[PDB]
């Protein structure tokens, strides 16, 4: 009769095998399934982003990115509203884990992470992204450039660019003039001669390289 709203609670419930689990970010009325990485760096990771097959297209609309889309098994996106509910009621830490086509792994951690924190309405505030202190892993620091930016899609242009950077990048992200990280770009599978439109982490493999796997993890403070 007691509900786990995040996946660090599931660690406290007594479950440590990484897999699909039900958490109640809204309330006990309706759950939403997610995949949790209980193995990496002590575990307790809630995953709001997974990509590896390239099958699911992430060039979706503002509504699909608000409500969430995909399968908790494979590639998916948890949904901006859900993300806002978690970060609203608890303080969270970010880790992103990346992999290229050369059997190399990398990552980057951010101490604080929140979507539109202390915003009375996420819509009005555009679901701004905030990230603070950055601890270096394999990859560099791309997200600090994005902090303070509303989430943008080809439906809703919030970026600071005259053009629609979400449209030019074939993805969705908290864009500024334009991204240093486009983890929702098109899965071009390796190197590409086009500019900054694939799943790109600028500081690790530049703008002309599309990763193979991608997932963004979240844990309690």
């Amino acid at each position: 009769l007691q509900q786990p709203l995040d996946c660090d609670d599931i660690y406290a419930q007594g479950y440590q095998s990484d897999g699909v689990y039900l958490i109640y970010p809204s309330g006990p009325s309706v759950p939403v399934p997610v995949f949790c990485d209980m193995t990496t760096e002590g575990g307790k990771w809630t995953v709001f982003q997974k990509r590896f097959n390239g099958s699911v297209s992430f060039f979706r609309g503002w509504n699909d990115y608000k409500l969430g889309f995909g399968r908790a098994d494979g590639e998916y996106w948890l949904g901006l509203q859900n993300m806002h509910l978690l970060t609203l009621k608890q303080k969270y830490e970010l880790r992103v884990d990346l992999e290229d086509f050369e059997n190399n792994t990398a990552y980057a951690k951010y101490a604080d992470f929140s979507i539109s924190p202390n915003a009375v309405s996420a819509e009005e505030d555009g679901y701004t992204l905030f990230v603070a202190g950055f601890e270096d892993g394999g990859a560099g620091d791309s997200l600090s450039y994005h902090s303070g930016q509303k989430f943008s899609t080809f439906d809703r242009d919030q970026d600071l660019f005259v053009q629609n950077c979400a449209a030019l990048s074939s993805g969705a992200f908290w864009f500024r003039s334009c991204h240093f990280a486009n983890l929702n770009g098109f899965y071009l599978g390796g190197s590409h001669l086009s500019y900054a439109n694939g799943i790109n982490w600028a500081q690790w493999k530049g703008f002309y390289y599309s990763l193979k796997r991608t997932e963004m993890k979240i844990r309690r403070a």
Partner: antibody
Amino acid sequence: QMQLVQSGPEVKKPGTSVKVSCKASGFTFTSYWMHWVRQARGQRLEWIGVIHPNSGNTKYNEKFRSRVTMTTDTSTSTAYMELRSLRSDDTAVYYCAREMWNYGNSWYFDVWGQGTTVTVSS
Amino acid sequence: DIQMTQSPSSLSASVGDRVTITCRASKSISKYLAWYQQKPGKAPELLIYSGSTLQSGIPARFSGSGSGTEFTLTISSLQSEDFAVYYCQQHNEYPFTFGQGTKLEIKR
């Protein structure tokens, strides 16, 4: 106060089984993970495995699988560890320890029992 | 898998001195390490965790540093209570290894 009360010492012959109990008081037993560690005298400590009382899920050390099995009695707030087939080198002090939670890696033991010296010899 | 080797095997120092103990890792272990203090015939007590963070109630003179393969435990000024055996734990991966143990004794 938060205390873990282990069983008294036992002397066993080779090949037999020993069952060590560890009772919890001062904290809700179902909330925290429980670890089992042995300290051979003047030697490096060895982590046996882990068990959570609420779920009963277990994760053992690779070399001790098939030999050790962990159970918990929720009503009595007791944690059990049992090594099935004993071996002369297993003579050591066996501790039960609680993993604190701490918004991250955790997996470090903040409260310990007080030792169950187990002697195996013919 | 992920052996832990402590150094020095035995160390002798007097009260008030600055003392340093080192734990070495066979493989890259990341930020995460913890130290313990075991008195004779007692259960170990946890001092430092995740490499550099100390437990509540532990004196301020205890401090830890290091990352990757090398780690260090240092005490600003010893006290009579500080003399014991110190152990280093693996902490990062789930095989879970421990350190060889370091004797800290008084020098006369």
